Amino acid sequence: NALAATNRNFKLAARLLGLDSKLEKSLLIPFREIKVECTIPKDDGTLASFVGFRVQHDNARGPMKGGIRYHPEVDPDEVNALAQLMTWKTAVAKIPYGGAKGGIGCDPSKLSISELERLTRVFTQKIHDLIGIHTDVPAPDMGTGPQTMAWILDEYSKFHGYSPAVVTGKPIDLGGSLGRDAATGRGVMFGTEALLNEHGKTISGQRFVIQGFGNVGSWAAKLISEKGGKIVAVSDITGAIKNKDGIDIPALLKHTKEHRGVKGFDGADPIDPNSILVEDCDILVPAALGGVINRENANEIKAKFIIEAANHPTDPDADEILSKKGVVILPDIYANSGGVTVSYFEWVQNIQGFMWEEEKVNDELKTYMTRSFKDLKEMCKTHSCDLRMGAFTLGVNRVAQATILRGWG
Amino acid sequence: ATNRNFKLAARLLGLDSKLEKSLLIPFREIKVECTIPKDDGTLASFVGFRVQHDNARGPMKGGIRYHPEVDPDEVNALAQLMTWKTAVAKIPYGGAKGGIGCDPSKLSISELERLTRVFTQKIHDLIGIHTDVPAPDMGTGPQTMAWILDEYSKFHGYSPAVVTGKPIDLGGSLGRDAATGRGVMFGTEALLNEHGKTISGQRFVIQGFGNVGSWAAKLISEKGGKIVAVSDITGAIKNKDGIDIPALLKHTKEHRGVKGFDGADPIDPNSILVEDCDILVPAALGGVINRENANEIKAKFIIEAANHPTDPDADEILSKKGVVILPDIYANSGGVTVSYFEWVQNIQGFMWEEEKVNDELKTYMTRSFKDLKEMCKTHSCDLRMGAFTLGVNRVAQATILRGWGA
Amino acid sequence: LAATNRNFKLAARLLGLDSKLEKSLLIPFREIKVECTIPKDDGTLASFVGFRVQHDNARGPMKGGIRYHPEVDPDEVNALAQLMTWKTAVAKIPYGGAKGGIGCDPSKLSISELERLTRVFTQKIHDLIGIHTDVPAPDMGTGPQTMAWILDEYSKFHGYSPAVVTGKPIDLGGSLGRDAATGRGVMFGTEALLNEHGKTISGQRFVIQGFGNVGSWAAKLISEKGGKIVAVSDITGAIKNKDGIDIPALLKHTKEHRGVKGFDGADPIDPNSILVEDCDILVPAALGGVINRENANEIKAKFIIEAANHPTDPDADEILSKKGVVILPDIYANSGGVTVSYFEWVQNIQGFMWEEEKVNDELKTYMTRSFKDLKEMCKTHSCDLRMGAFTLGVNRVAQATILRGWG
Amino acid sequence: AATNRNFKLAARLLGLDSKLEKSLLIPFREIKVECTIPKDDGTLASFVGFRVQHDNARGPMKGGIRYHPEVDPDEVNALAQLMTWKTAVAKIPYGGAKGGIGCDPSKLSISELERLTRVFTQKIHDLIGIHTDVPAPDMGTGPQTMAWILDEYSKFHGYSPAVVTGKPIDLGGSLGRDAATGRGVMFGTEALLNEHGKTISGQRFVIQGFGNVGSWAAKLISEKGGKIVAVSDITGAIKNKDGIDIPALLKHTKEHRGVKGFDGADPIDPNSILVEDCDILVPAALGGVINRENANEIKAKFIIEAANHPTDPDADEILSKKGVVILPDIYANSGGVTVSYFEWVQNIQGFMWEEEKVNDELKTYMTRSFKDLKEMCKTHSCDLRMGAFTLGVNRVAQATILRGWGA
Ligand SMILES: NC(=O)c1ccc[n+]([C@@H]2O[C@H](COP(=O)([O-])OP(=O)(O)OC[C@H]3O[C@@H](n4cnc5c(N)ncnc54)[C@H](O)[C@@H]3O)[C@@H](O)[C@H]2O)c1
Ligand SMILES: NC(=O)c1ccc[n+]([C@@H]2O[C@H](COP(=O)([O-])OP(=O)(O)OC[C@H]3O[C@@H](n4cnc5c(N)ncnc54)[C@H](O)[C@@H]3O)[C@@H](O)[C@H]2O)c1
Ligand SMILES: NC(=O)c1ccc[n+]([C@@H]2O[C@H](COP(=O)([O-])OP(=O)(O)OC[C@H]3O[C@@H](n4cnc5c(N)ncnc54)[C@H](O)[C@@H]3O)[C@@H](O)[C@H]2O)c1
Ligand SMILES: NC(=O)c1ccc[n+]([C@@H]2O[C@H](COP(=O)([O-])OP(=O)(O)OC[C@H]3O[C@@H](n4cnc5c(N)ncnc54)[C@H](O)[C@@H]3O)[C@@H](O)[C@H]2O)c1
Ligand SMILES: [K+]
Ligand SMILES: [K+]
Ligand SMILES: [K+]
Ligand SMILES: [K+]
């Protein structure tokens, strides 16, 4: 229902643009799909064989960009859909990349740290000729992180010389960008302010509910409350809390670092975790899992705005229900694009051999997301469509035009 | 399954199960978009692909198929089979298989050239004289290879060894037309010698009269073999005293087929495999020897010129009747061996005379039959299992030597 | 062109250049001709000769346009490549000079044949050009779409390389401000030259011949600074208004018609008399050779800004110098274009595009400095602006060449 | 001298498409590079190096490097094209090229010549290569020049002996290269004679020229029983109707300036050498020595063109009607280029051959070329010269067509 939603949205956008069927078919087929054998000796000496893979969906607008997932549940349709989605997302963000997605079918929880390094290095050896600073730039995803990127960078640099721009999400000490940690949450705050301004409103005074308090949710809550938003309820995997007068986010952040989660926070009451999405508020921010808003709770949402920080939190049934209630939904492909935008800035800084101060990273991020929202808004006016459809048509249109300009022979 | 021969071979060997799993997984699988402008200006998009199964023993080798019916399991099985066949042949290659999902009968010659060049552009960094050397297959031919060579050479400089099956004027090897049929004759003499016999005087039945069948008939009859019956798609003919192959060849060039040949009587095409003879050579399609006719085969030797003419049921039946079956993976390997010789000549920058091509082919197929026979003694198995056991073992030992990085 | 070698040899005289170094500077680094054969749309073969003269790379990668035009003259191509070497040095951008093209008639080729020809040409020269080797650009017969095709084909051989050509569409990495660049530079150089005479653009009365990319942008930006545009001409006719032509109003007219002809707010005039119109500043921005042995005595302008290439011939150079007319030479006056193409390459190399405000501020900085350096050479060698420009460029190339050495 | 007419006649005999013929005439690539060196006196000297790469449909290009002040572009292009046809006639997997430097080696010290050779190599190394373009000696260059090229090129690409031919034996030159052209002259003569039911043994030969080609041809022909009845060189002409003792003559010629004064032969008028009574005439010195004034009196039944262009078109017609069979130079002296192919092969294969193998392969190659040449003459009802050109043009055309023209 995320792979179905990507191809449904692409085809709806292609019809709004009047795309020729033969160009549409070209845009659907990935540039390249690669599967490689990754066999390593385990710590006990015996062999273990894994399949690594990389779908490189499109490079009309620049090098491909996308995460590397270490996860046993590999589905070819889902991986292809995610690589295709990144092609549209980078175009919406107006960063000079196409989309890719890769990974290894493995369970990292069953591998030692030494086996994970051996597997990462073998995988890099098997694909180093297929990726590259101006070809395809990987990033972390489920099951991988900054240490994984460090190993990819180190192994790749044996083959091509020191090449920090070959991956993003690196530790700061190896060329990671300042502002990366806050990037997605900060972009959520920027896009919310852009949307509210369009309705003559401002973050200050608005009441927020945030489901999820991880990298995205905690930064969004911190930065939104610093602009005067009142965060009246938050949840994570350990429980849900509420304070109608507003949760003290600095105190909550201090609580959550010392405990497993928001549960037990002194400055808020615990509440039914299944009630968080239907709490009275102005703005609802799903920032944990997808599929949480469906035909069953959609009629009970009280927010006027939904900011999709998580990927695919709303299904198509709830979209129609919420549209008819007058709820405005800022779509995920734009709302959480602060992360991929600052990953572009990381690559830029590495390419330029010179890192930026955090203020510059955040000022460029604001510039980029203001421009994307304006272009998204103009697409909606041009095609008389909602925000989700404006973002897909914007992204598809940019890729189609770059493809047409470059030609076919 | 199509893995049955491999899995049986891994058990005759003592193959560690984790190494066995590794040998099954292909080194690399690639799918690329191939989009071209058609003659009418509109776009056409195709998917090109290449399964690179194994390169422990050297560059990968395998055909390029232009055909609308792509089956991933079959492409993978054929690439894996090539890995074992090159090892049986003792040529320094692994296996690969590739193609484009397209229908060439619906594409103009200029569109086919454009598609071939775009496909080459999309894979040029994945193939190479010491990496992966393609060849013709269904839907492709020497002209296709010429276009691949020409486009590849724009990216890497002039590289004639990057494909085999090229036209002679572009570095193709002499003796390629006859190679598979000649190897069928070489392999038959090697098997017969082991039984204290020779081709001269033996009665052959040959099903199929194409590139393999006609060359085998011509060369076997020139060694004194009596070709008593032949068939093709147009009909079957018989002459108990021996068919005049030179006359039949002249007839087939002028009449589209063996049908109507003067000097042979016509027979039921469905009875050719059970004709009385010494040596049966299926050289047309696979699956023609099965559990329904196997008990009625009269030959003492079956030479598998075609790919998989005998199914496992017939193997069992024919073994207990005392019939010796020269397996396809060895018997028709003259083709892949001479394609190695083509690559060698290109690498050496100097072409061989046909006499040298044929002498080296005889040496290679004699030595490979010798090693296959020794494998059969070691493991007390038939020829087919000796061949798979030989090929898997060679790949396994090269893989173990190269290691995994510790 | 013996006129381009005349300015070079004079500059080599003024500097103390060793005669063997002078000979070296004349000889191009490389000259390449390649066969470009394509199937035509009707199936038959067509063969063209593509070429690239790479004149000098002492100061950095070579830079120069690609011309699709049937009338190829080897002398002219060499002269333009050499002139680009001095011009990049005058602008102080880290490039040398090159010039290339294909002898073909684009008006006789379909858009499909033109794409095929461009890709084949690229395949035939891809190993001879490159991001840090030689960076082509549009010229007569080519444009942004041509550069897109070169970029796309080149990238098959070397990976995505947006900095390999300049003049790209904005969507493929072209720079903001490229359209206005040459005209903006013409205006920048005019203000610098006037300030040296204690004057400002504001109030000066301009005649501009040509209303194309250079002329219309020059006319627009000069008028916004208070310049009085008293006469303008193009291929369709000439107009005059002693109080100044309303350029925003003229721009609306000229985009909806074939030209300035019929413009309300200006009276029509004889097209062949615009160059001798009473004014302070004359801006030839159309073709070359329009200032010659006979009209030199009747131009009323005290300043001539060479927006077009070589609008003044040596005979008029002699006449106007003795008449006290100041000529801002083409090699500096129109260098805004090549300077912003350098900025486009910089932005692609840096992986990050600039705002237009930054492009135009950098353009002002570069053209201010080159005018300052050019004026200093005129003092050192007691020469006119044209020789100050050539001595500045030749000297920069000579010093880089000497430092890099031989062996 | 450079009659390009043979090609056009061959293209019509083959019925070549007119657009394909035009493509075959246009060179793949023409390159001019600056070669500037410090001279021994410290000052700079600038030279122009060049390479015409005519065709590579059949494989890497092959051709000499000329150090000579008289560079003519039309001549260089014609020679590169001729090499394309000659390699095709010989059936060696090469196309044609020709290059050089405009310089006078007699005015350069050996240190300057080395510096110039290394600078030239640095300026073209990316344009040539073991599988791209393989240079060789020519006028003004020799084995030592090739050694310097090999050495400089190998700094950029690792040890690459196959990048040039004509190397000293110690750096990968082939055994049998010295005798190659003369031996090929002897092979082609025997092949031609067999077609007429004759053999070398007993035939009477007259040989003009006693250098690398003439002396080896004479030595090998007499060892096959040919009677060498008259020989000439730059010093004079000598005659012996019973046959000259070539081993004795060779020993005489190293101790003197020439065949003049040889004790085993009487001197003859040097202007009568071509009209001497014999069976086989072998011009092996200069071109143009057979023309309309001596043609009617040639006594030979066969003419073996060892030198380049010894018979002009006028004599071809005269001698054809007298029934004289002329073995054309493009084939007759191809032993040299064939053994240079064998040198490349040996270097590529990392393992040098014995002289016996070189000479056996040369016999195989030249026997086959003569058979293909003779068959072309039957197909197209033409003489030996046109059979050779149509054979070579046809091979290049067929390779070009097979490789195709898509992008
Ligand atoms: N981090 C980024 O830059 C980024 C960018 C794009 C999209 N996203 C999307 O954002 C979402 C969250 O990302 P993250 O990086 O913050 O993840 P994270 O792992 O840092 O945090 C996820 C949070 O959700 C909470 N959570 C998990 N399951 C829950 C449940 N059932 N109910 C309530 N809370 C639950 C966790 O406890 C945690 O607080 C995912 O859908 C992800 O795809 C993240
Ligand atoms: N040719 C090679 O180099 C090579 C290599 C490996 C394996 N093989 C195998 O050899 C077999 C034959 O290949 P080929 O190149 O000789 O083919 P081909 O197309 O040149 O000739 C095939 C012959 O089989 C006959 N035939 C076709 N269908 C028939 C039918 N239903 N009944 C009877 N006769 C029939 C045809 O009339 C023809 O005489 C194939 O199975 C192929 O996989 C060939
Ligand atoms: N455009 C640049 O960036 C640039 C840079 C360097 C040099 N130049 C030189 O500047 C000149 C003009 O370039 P452009 O880009 O403005 O050209 P353009 O194609 O934009 O048009 C120039 C204008 O001149 C007019 N014109 C043409 N012929 C005329 C004539 N005989 N009389 C009067 N008007 C005439 C045209 O109608 C048009 O209005 C050319 O010589 C060019 O090489 C331009
Ligand atoms: N050597 C080769 O490999 C080779 C290959 C192709 C073509 N050729 C052609 O062969 C011819 C000779 O080649 P070579 O290597 O033997 O040259 P060389 O310099 O070794 O010998 C030339 C000989 O001709 C004699 N000679 C010069 N001028 C003469 C004249 N006017 N009358 C009579 N004799 C005269 C000289 O004294 C000398 O004996 C030239 O046309 C050359 O282009 C040579
Ligand atoms: K695509
Ligand atoms: K494997
Ligand atoms: K120079
Ligand atoms: K050509």
Residue numbers in the entry:
A (entry chain A): 2 to 410
B (entry chain B): 6 to 411
C (entry chain C): 4 to 410
D (entry chain D): 5 to 411
Copy out sentences from the published article reporting this entry, exactly as the authors wrote them:
GDHs release the ammonium cation from glutamate in a reversible, NAD(P)+-dependent oxidative deamination reaction that yields 2OG. We have provided detailed structural and kinetic information about the functioning of AtGDH1, one of three mitochondrial NAD+-dependent GDHs in A. thaliana. The asymmetric unit of both crystal structures is comprised of a homohexameric oligomer with non-crystallographic 32 (D3) symmetry. A subunit of AtGDH1 is comprised of 411 amino acid residues (44.5 kDa) and can be subdivided into two domains.
In the AtGDH1-NAD+ complex, five subunits are in the open conformation (χ 70.2°–73.9°). The sixth subunit is in a closed conformation, characterized by the χ angle of 49.1°. The remarkably different conformation of AtGDH1 domain II in the open and closed states is correlated with other structural features. Notably, 2OG had not been added to the protein preparation at any stage of purification or crystallization and, therefore, must have been captured from Escherichia coli cells during the recombinant protein expression. Each AtGDH1 subunit binds one molecule of the NAD+ coenzyme in a niche between domain I and domain II. In the closed subunit, the NAD cofactor is significantly more buried and, therefore, less exposed to the outer environment. The envelopment of NAD is primarily the result of the closing movement of domain II toward domain I, as the interactions of the coenzyme with domain II in the closed form are very similar to those in the open form. In our closed-conformation subunit (with 2OG in the active site), NAD+ is clearly oriented in a way that is compatible with hydride transfer to the Si face of nicotinamide. The distance between the C4 atom of NAD+ and C2 of 2OG is 4.2 Å in the closed structure.
